[PDB]
Amino acid sequence: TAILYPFTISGNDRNGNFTINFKGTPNSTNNGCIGYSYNGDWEKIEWEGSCDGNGNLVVEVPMSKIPAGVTSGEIQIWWHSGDLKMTDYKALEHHHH
Ligand SMILES: OC[C@H]1O[C@@H](O[C@H]2[C@H](O)[C@H](O)[C@H](O[C@H]3[C@H](O)[C@H](O)[C@H](O[C@H]4[C@H](O)[C@H](O)[C@H](O[C@H]5[C@H](O)[C@H](O)[C@H](O)O[C@@H]5CO)O[C@@H]4CO)O[C@@H]3CO)O[C@@H]2CO)[C@@H](O)[C@@H](O)[C@@H]1O
Numbered sequence: 001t002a003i004l005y006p007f008t009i010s011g012n013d014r015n016g017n018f019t020i021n022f023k024g025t026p027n028s029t030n031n032g033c034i035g036y037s038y039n040g041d042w043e044k045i046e047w048e049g050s051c052d053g054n055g056n057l058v059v060e061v062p063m064s065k066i067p068a069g070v071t072s073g074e075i076q077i078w079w080h081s082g083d084l085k086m087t088d089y090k091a092l093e094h095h096h097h
Contacts, residue, residue: 025082
């Protein structure tokens, strides 16, 4: 039961990380990706992790994994053993709550 969150980025700036905060069922098992179209073809930077006792999960990916010229994509949740939602993401110095 996939969940998709669209995003837009600069095509040029690639310093730092793409950081995602999720809230979900404590101790849940979760995975997904950061996906994007690269010259029309879909590529995926997979992520996985378990929520802590408070139900929080932070995912970090280097921005350098997204090729130059890419301007849009989706944060995707794939597997979630309980509940999971994106509460914030940060890329290229910009938070999105
Ligand atoms: O460890 C937990 C659990 O994992 C189990 O195996 C999982 C596995 O870990 C993954 O969760 C896997 O994930 C697949 C998803 O179920 C789903 O099919 C997903 O589909 C994506 C697709 O990959 C792609 O990103 C697609 O992007 C679109 C985009 O949305 C946009 O429309 C654009 O224009 O087009 C692109 C391309 O079409 O979006 C889809 C989501 O809608 O793909 C995942 C794999 O890449 O599922 C497995 C379960 O079947 C087991 O190992 C288990 O034992 C273990 O407990």
